[PDB]
Amino acid sequence: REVYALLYSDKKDAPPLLPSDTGQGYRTVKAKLGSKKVRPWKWMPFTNPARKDGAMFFHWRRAAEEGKDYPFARFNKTVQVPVYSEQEYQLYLHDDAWTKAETDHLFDLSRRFDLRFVVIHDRYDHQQFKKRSVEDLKERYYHICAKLANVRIPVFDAGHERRRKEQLERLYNRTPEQVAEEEYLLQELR
Amino acid sequence: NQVHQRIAELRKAGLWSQRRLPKLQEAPRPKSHWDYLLEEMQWMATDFAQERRWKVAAAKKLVRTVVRHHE
Amino acid sequence: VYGGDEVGALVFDIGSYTVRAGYAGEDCPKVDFPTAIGMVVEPTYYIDTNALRVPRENMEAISPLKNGMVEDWDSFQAILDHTYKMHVKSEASLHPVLMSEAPWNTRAKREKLTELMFEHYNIPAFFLCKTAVLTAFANGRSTGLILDSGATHTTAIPVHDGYVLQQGIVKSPLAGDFITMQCRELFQEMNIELVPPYMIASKEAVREGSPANWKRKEKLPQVTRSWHNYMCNCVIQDFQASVLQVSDSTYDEQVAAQMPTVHYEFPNGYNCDFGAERLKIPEGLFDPSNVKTMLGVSHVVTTSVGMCDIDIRPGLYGSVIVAGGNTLIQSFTDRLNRELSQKTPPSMRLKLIANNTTVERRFSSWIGGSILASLGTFQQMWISKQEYEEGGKQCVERKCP
Amino acid sequence: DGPFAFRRKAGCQYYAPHLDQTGNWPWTSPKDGGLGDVRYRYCLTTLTVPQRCIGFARRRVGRGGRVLLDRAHSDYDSVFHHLDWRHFRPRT
Amino acid sequence: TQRIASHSHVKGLGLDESGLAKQAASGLVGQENAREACGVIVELIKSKKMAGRAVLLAGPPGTGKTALALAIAQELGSKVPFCPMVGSEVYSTEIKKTEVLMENFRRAIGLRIKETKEVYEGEVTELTPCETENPKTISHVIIGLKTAKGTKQLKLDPSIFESLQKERVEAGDVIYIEANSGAVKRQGRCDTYATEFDLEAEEYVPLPKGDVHKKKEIIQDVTLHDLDVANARPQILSMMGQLMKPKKTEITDKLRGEINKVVNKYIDQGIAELVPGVLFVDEVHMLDIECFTYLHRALESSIAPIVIFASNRGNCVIRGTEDITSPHGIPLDLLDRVMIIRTMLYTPQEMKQIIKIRAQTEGINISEEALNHLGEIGTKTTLRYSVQLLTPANLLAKINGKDSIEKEHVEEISELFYDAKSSAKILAD
Amino acid sequence: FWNLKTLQEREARLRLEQEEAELLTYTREDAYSMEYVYEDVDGQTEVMPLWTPPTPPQDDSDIYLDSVMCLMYEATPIPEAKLPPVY
Ligand SMILES: Nc1ncnc2c1ncn2[C@@H]1O[C@H](COP(=O)(O)OP(=O)(O)OP(O)(O)=S)[C@@H](O)[C@H]1O
Ligand SMILES: Nc1ncnc2c1ncn2[C@@H]1O[C@H](COP(=O)(O)OP(=O)(O)OP(O)(O)=S)[C@@H](O)[C@H]1O
Ligand SMILES: [Mg+2]
């Protein structure tokens, strides 16, 4: 038996226990605190090498840590997305169903939103270019990536994903009588 | 029986949820900067909620102790 | 790598009701003054509560925001200057600023806001995030259906992976202002003369239903109709907070009549028992068809999710976040949860995040802004002034998604 | 099956749907359909000072590097106080 | 435990659920009928119904009579008191022989005492009296006690004020207060106030762990002989008694009856439970006629333990008689009171099995041909002799850098050491 | 009666003192110096998990997982043994 929660489990939860000295009294820990002295902290500018501009923000950091490389810069790495020349498109990637500027818009969005195709679909310029389903965006992206890799791996199956979503939509839209029916079948077929 | 035909007709229509299609695996990718940002965000939000709960409870404790000191 | 880095950034969340501001890393906005400001045509601006509540000749009450977006940039600059000088007490060029924005904010308005922040206030860094994402971030959720009901709109905003799915935004005009108008109509039907507290020199205790025995303040200057309407709106909103209650189910006259009455005292000493009409008024938020084609809040919810990818609908129903002041009406959360559980598909888990307090409902966007601004991983996201030198038009739309 | 039949293609892998139990977020119990990712779990914990079980707790790092014990309410908290399942205790 | 004795391999009677003896199990080989009779004796002991029942293990030397008695001891467990004696022990210089016999009888009756104590222990945090008007008058004395678990306040009877000052209790003292008597006992300053600079030893104790209020169960195992000795001579008369030699005394039947009464009262009160056990008398033919006659009366007591005799003497004159020969050195009158279990000689195969089990218990690697040679040595000579050859042959092998005994090592050790019969042969020549 | 009243008033005061929060802080030794372990009936040991801020990636082993996908499908690819053959 155990409990799971994110932020907290219930409104009646007891407060967290914070660490602190002197909880057993200051007098007993007097000699330890008096034996030492704190290291100096500074309000200092820091370079973030993940940023390309070079802007300097400020930190509370120890004096010896001044000028050290920003640790959060290690997180910075983007989702690998291929880049193609105008020539490579003209040679290989041409499709009568897709404009080049439309594909370039798709790939720019992909680089922006880390291949989160639901977000790409939301941000896709359906007004200027043709309306696209998320399966169409995935199809075009994975087709281009596979073709570029072959020119210079689980392949995408657009039909299977389309069928999967259509089935999920059909299962979602059904009336409460049509889910009462299914649960009554599921319980009576046992 | 008739229930079997009903199930078969639902399955033909796709509406039989017991036989839902699987999901084709996306090509694998490592975590991006935004994924680490959302992880750190979730951790910081937890720390905020717990710190607020601690400050409220500690204030209540100290004030009721002062009231007992006067009583 | 370590805990999030605090870079001394400011978090501004300027809504139509109150301007919420403070320092990043705090768990509550250190200031929230009404968005409505006083204007005298010369213009002289009276901005905060201490100044608004005193009568002045030829002073109008206006708001910089219109439909969740800023329209009058002069009043916006006035509010920003007042916030800085009085509450922030620090130079604008010294602290990075993270501001919230409406889910539906236009590109030109975002560019104008960024231009104002960089050219006028000379801030070192800037970021503009959506209110819905910050509300989700305040709850530690990267995805979910934000349901915001302030004074201007009741809006469902689907967030996925920290991004607002703008196609799924559904907005309704039923909000706190609609409730204020409904209470105004109720008072008019009962022939209660709304006397704002500023006109009362003295009052005497009277019984329920008795005529008010109050003395009018003398030497009162002439006031504009806008300021009088604003003061009446203030008293009506006090009434809304104190009296109104959402029925635990679909409103019924008999059940409403059975339940006990609640007593309220108006500023002029007039007091009454408000019976069952206190339940009828909030019912318009849920069943607008009975108010003398708007969608109910539960229908705004269920419509908004239906416009998203069905891969993400399980997550949207699995994380419903309620925010906004108008959601603090008694039993509003319970009624909403009941209706959504009744309407939600059985195959998907529905869970309303349990945070129901004034701080967690009204300031949620500011809390999310503070959380985001305190992240070390977020320090890459800032728009710098050097970046504004080149991409003043180009990058501002691209840097803040 | 017909219009919604499963057709495998070469060089492809698939994720089976959830049928027995509806899924849930990682921060939720496997009894509640969740992944149960252990960073979210609260388990019974004993302190050294006081030498008493504080009940269900989880170790979480705070903002300043401060390690914090989050605590979850339970109806049997008094019994856990009298106590001397997965029950963690500190050791050098 | 760790050192290996002549019976260290006997782990019990190798009996099945049906009471039949396995051919070789639990360290015993053969003696199937004798082992089955010993198992019935074990059931008799565990029944606890009977008193003074006697059994005689009888048979040639080295037929496992002592092994069977120690196997009964293993089967009964460590709870049942099993008192070994040899008949030579009755001839004491401090007390008469029949007193030695009665003392060993009472050593084989166990009693298990159960004490349940309720105690309130903790570090003293307050001693505030509660003043009142009498219908300064105090109606209660409040004591606050702290343990590692928590803190409790007690509303004690005011009369406990005498014991608090008698014990000189102050704040910071660990004390305990028993529920029944209400008397406080002080056990030192809490060690949280000890510095490394001050010198005291007995006056500091660690802060108690656990809840302030505790319920303790104390279980003690004693024999009736322990109670006899305790009540016969309790521990200036003590100074002279401890300076002088505390000899054994001829405890009177009056004391034994009083202790029987007290133990029956405890058993009625539920505080105690009796565990009657076994007295084993090896070499019982060393007893004399006075001892055997006394044993007639001793075994007819309703309080007596179950006694196991062993003899190998055959038709032998009874000690302390003249020319009275008896079938076991044990007069026919006493033999009429005992059930007899016969033990029989071993076959060569049974001897080989015993030799192998001994080599295993001694940790000795023995080759097959060495085992056959040692078995045939044991079919000559004696079993005991052939077993005794194992470890010196292992040592001889270790000297020659062999991890296992080879036949040549057995031969050489046999040439070095001789048995009783070969030595009688040398003496005759 | 006066004593009964005073004891009920005392128990009320003690209840008020106990309803208030008991613990708000724990020692530094427990916080950092000592690791928390659990030993089961077989002697296997488990260390209590620590929810830390995200660790920087050393390689591309930090594979992304869609937490919303895991609400409808399970996180492991179907084994080829139970996968139906190619259509
Ligand atoms: N405790 C309360 N109970 C009931 N209504 C309240 C309460 N507090 C605030 N309100 C109402 O909530 C509305 C303001 O909510 P907010 O979300 O703070 O507005 P805002 O966010 O500043 O501006 P918008 O409309 O969201 S752009 C007003 O109509 C208030 O009357
Ligand atoms: N059946 C048996 N199984 C295993 N070991 C045995 C067996 N019988 C005897 N032994 C062992 O061989 C030795 C001889 O047995 P003992 O019990 O000593 O014989 P005994 O009958 O006591 O001979 P006496 O009469 O005392 S000289 C001891 O070391 C026993 O442990
Ligand atoms: Mg708002």
Ligand SMILES: [Mg+2]
């Ligand atoms: Mg013997």
